[PDB]
A paper describes a structure:
TRIM7 catalyzes the ubiquitination of multiple substrates with unrelated biological functions. Here we show that TRIM7′s extreme substrate promiscuity is due to a highly unusual binding mechanism, in which the PRYSPRY domain captures any ligand with a C-terminal helix that terminates in a hydrophobic residue followed by a glutamine. Many of the non-structural proteins found in RNA viruses contain C-terminal glutamines as a result of polyprotein cleavage by 3C protease. This viral processing strategy generates novel substrates for TRIM7 and explains its ability to inhibit Coxsackie virus and norovirus replication.
TRIM7 was also previously identified in a genome-wide overexpression screen as an inhibitor of the picorna-like virus calicivirus murine norovirus (MNV), an activity similarly found to be PRYSPRY-dependent. CVB3 contains eight proteins ending in Q, while MNV1 contains two. Remarkably, in ITC experiments with TRIM7 PRYSPRY, all peptides bound with comparable affinity. Solving the co-crystal structures of each complex revealed that the different peptides are bound in the same PRYSPRY pocket, with the penultimate two residues responsible for most of the binding interaction. For example, human norovirus proteins do not have identical C-termini as MNV1 proteins (e.g., in Norwalk virus, NS6 ends in EGETALE rather than LEALEFQ, but NS3 maintains a terminal LQ).
Numbering used by the authors: -2 to 170
Amino acid sequence: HHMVELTLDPDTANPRLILSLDLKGVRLGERAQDLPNHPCRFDTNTRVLASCGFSSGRHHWEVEVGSKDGWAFGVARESVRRKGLTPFTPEEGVWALQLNGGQYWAVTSPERSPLSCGHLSRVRVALDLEVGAVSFYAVEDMRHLYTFRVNFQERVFPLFSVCSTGTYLRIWP
């Protein structure tokens, strides 16, 4: 199965995020690193993109996910805002799933959409820029979790947020 190789982009990472050395894994730390601000860095929201943005075609990858609340992952338009507190919503260029209050959500606005999917360990993301879709599948039985149909009009970047200690996101492969 032909999947893209993604690495987290340290220039984008919120200063409190802890990236692994292989740039696959993301946790939230207790203290903000002293990092030089970069126009790309999320200075307030607890997010980080892969260094790869997408302009065209179909691309797959997988995300392993902690069992404790705190994570959200998906894709974001390149213009997603980095500076100050920003809403986490499709309006703002953010199409994600989320584990929060013991519940899986698709992050619709103005209300999140509860998913009835059972426990997740690993999710396949399929980004289709030709049709304009991003779908999520539980790898155990490739069960369908959610699709956002979107007419993407700029580059689309894999997105990760961890806003609690005690949980993680890991990119595969």
